[PDB]
Paper text:
As part of investigations into the C-nucleoside formycin A (8-aza-9-deazaadenosine) biosynthetic gene cluster from Streptomyces kaniharaensis, we have characterised a pyridoxal 5′-phosphate (PLP) dependent aminotransferase (ForI) that aminates a pathway intermediate. ForI is a PLP-dependent enzyme from the biosynthetic pathway of the C-nucleoside antibiotic formycin. ForI possesses the mixed β-sheet and three-stranded antiparallel β-sheet insertion characteristic of the PLP dependent aspartic aminotransferase family. The predicted active site of ForI comprises residues from two monomers, indicating the dimer to be the functional unit.
Author numbering:
A (entry chain B), B (entry chain A): 0 to 423
The structure:
Amino acid sequence: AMITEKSAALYARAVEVMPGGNSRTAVYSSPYPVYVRSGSGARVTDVDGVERIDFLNNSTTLIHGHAHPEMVEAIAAAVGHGTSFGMPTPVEVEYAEALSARNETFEHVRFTSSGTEAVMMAVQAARAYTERPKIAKIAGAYHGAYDAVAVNNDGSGNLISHAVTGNPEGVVANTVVIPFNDPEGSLEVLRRHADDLACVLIDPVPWRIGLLPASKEWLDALREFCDASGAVLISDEVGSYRVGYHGAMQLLGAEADITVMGKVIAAGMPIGAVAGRRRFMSVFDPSKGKPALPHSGSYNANPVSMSSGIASLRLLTPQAHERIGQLGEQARGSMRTALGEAGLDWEVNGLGSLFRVVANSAPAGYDSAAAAMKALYWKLLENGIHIGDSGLGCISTPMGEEEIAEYAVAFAKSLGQVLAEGRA
Amino acid sequence: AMITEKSAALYARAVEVMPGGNSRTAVYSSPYPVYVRSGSGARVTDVDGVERIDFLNNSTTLIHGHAHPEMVEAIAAAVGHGTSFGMPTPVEVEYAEALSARNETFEHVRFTSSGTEAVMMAVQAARAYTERPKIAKIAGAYHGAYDAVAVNNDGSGNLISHAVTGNPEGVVANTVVIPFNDPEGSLEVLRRHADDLACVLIDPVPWRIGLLPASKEWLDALREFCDASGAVLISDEVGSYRVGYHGAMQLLGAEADITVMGKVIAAGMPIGAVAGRRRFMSVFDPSKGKPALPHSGSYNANPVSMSSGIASLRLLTPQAHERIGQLGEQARGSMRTALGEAGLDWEVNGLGSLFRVVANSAPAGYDSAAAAMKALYWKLLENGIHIGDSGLGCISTPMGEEEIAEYAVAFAKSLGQVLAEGRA
Ligand SMILES: Cc1ncc(COP(=O)(O)O)c(/C=N\OC[C@@H]2NC(=O)[C@H](CON)NC2=O)c1O
Ligand SMILES: Cc1ncc(COP(=O)(O)O)c(/C=N\OC[C@@H]2NC(=O)[C@H](CON)NC2=O)c1O
């Protein structure tokens, strides 16, 4: 039934001017991805004119969905006064005040143009503060393309160093890898490197290794180790921040030294933030002579991203947070029911407005769990739903009971078609 | 004469929620910078309601000046359709076609959210392509905060490794430095590392070491060395692209393997680009199995930045390029006349629409050339002009000969006040 002629035609143009017609690896699909032209509320219209409900929302960025009227007003008005300046603006101060208010530990903030930049500057801040070379990160957790964190970032639980082709030993040797939610196995690695560890970089709810939350026991172990060793505890919440009204660490009963944020904090415009205790952030302070850590960037704190941020945080009320959490719980419950009725051993993980279908046993006619999940992704597209091709989805504030109910129908239908085609 | 009480009040708020009240080192001034609220054409209005002519234009980003009506229309329309998506859009293809058309060597392009990211991904591409660890860069040249290029990036001509506090040996040892416009001195270093060199990273007109162009002799030496060694020649034109209609290397009669771009290519919205021959860019291609170099990012090719880019390149006509070049020549000429009549030995460098006052001999009452230039920056603010605090300025398309004449009057007056206050 699904017509993708206009997507095919865009891809044929794209391959002439981009590598494999791609500018962002995560959005590529074989033989070509669906191209989209517009979004309104919870829905996206593709270039072939097909409207679908968006349950991934630019990889969980769009907490307020597409072209939220209050977001559009704030952003378009900011654009009309100037997109960026070589001078600070009132809105950077207002937005820093708004974000600092969200958690006790967000005492001092700096803005970047991406979570990728923000993770990089948080790592650089820990290295400048401690004057130690090594970082520890979770086996399998993704933190963007910065070479120090683009190590064991592929969802593998293995601790053996595995990096991108060309990432030198000089980088890779200074990133050590700990097992998620294994306190004893983590402390073994951390104690070995204690003298040389600038930071322990975690995601409290990492997507790529199943969207399971960090245990109280594991977070307590890392907090105690960082306190004892002087290593900086960095919580990368670029994705996971949204699980809690005060972020992921606070929800799970822990305190970071530095938190990395992005995505939902501006809900669609380019943003990252480094937010931490004054002493850790003091490496950036240029007011008492040259800073220990210079940090510039043409779009840092640009008033369009700052205005997007102010509007996003204003719309992210405790009531809106609670409501998308309830819709997330309902969505996860309905998916577990549908998977059970279909006879699959697949799990549904997630907190609040986040979920992930984690494919376990490959059904008949699929070479892998991952191939079965890709087939479900394509069947959901055919049945009017966007999710992630490895099972990630999320609730947006424009959604109500009706969108969740429609998702549940499309999910059950799509499972049936995936299984039937595997046996065909 | 100058009232900055509303800037002082914003700074008093800022220091509570940012390190030293700062989110971008380059825009900080002691005791506080001037905060701005709006821009229109060539003019910026500060928070105290004072309108000035902007001659730095967000560090040379705003080639079309502030809130250009055709830019604002294109950006606001894109915002209305959705700020970012987890799917590619028509405008990323249209913008890649427009940017590819600017230079023979821009066969394939990849979009990032900043020049900082684009530099990082160009270096990662060269390392993935060659599977060699080392990069060569210019002594003193700035390329953003990415730790492999945040080495000898402070305007010094010394070849001795000098990096940010905390940047590990593991990074710093794999970045070697060459003397700008010294062919034999550069080849000595390059030939020592030839077997291990992934890339030679240059800026053809580097700001931080005086905004003087690369010589034909030096570019020929590097081009020949890269051809012989297999090292990738990367031209970082994030700042310098605008000197030529086809970019900086083409103006100077040279070809890069990869070009890094940003700033003017979208003229205000967050952007970077990596553009080069298909073979170098093929590491990013995800269409024939897993790519050698994964490269994602939440805002990569976002339709708002792509729409800003389409509008910017449409406005950057050969006629616009010619005219802002005329105004740059007039500005540089007027500054040289004013410096000569004031009895200063300071030089004015630049090509096309870029200029830099390079302070040489400190006049009476100033401890350094840099302190005298900072004083000139403050006096120019008092006299209704924004320039860079180290003497960088540039032309925007809304300017005419009248703005450059007003600048010349303010420049002569400001020199007089700087010298008189030094003798006080
Ligand atoms: C923890 C974390 N840190 C940094 C970033 C990068 O932020 P960005 O430059 O604003 O896109 C991100 C952003 N995106 O990660 C990609 C996202 N996260 C994932 O783990 C999986 C695997 O992706 N490669 N799929 C996804 O779409 C992040 O999640
Ligand atoms: C060659 C080059 N490569 C990369 C970047 C970073 O791009 P961005 O992340 O889009 O701001 C830039 C951007 N800014 O450099 C800062 C600019 N360049 C300079 O050389 C001097 C010295 O730096 N502070 N003053 C400046 O304000 C760049 O010029």
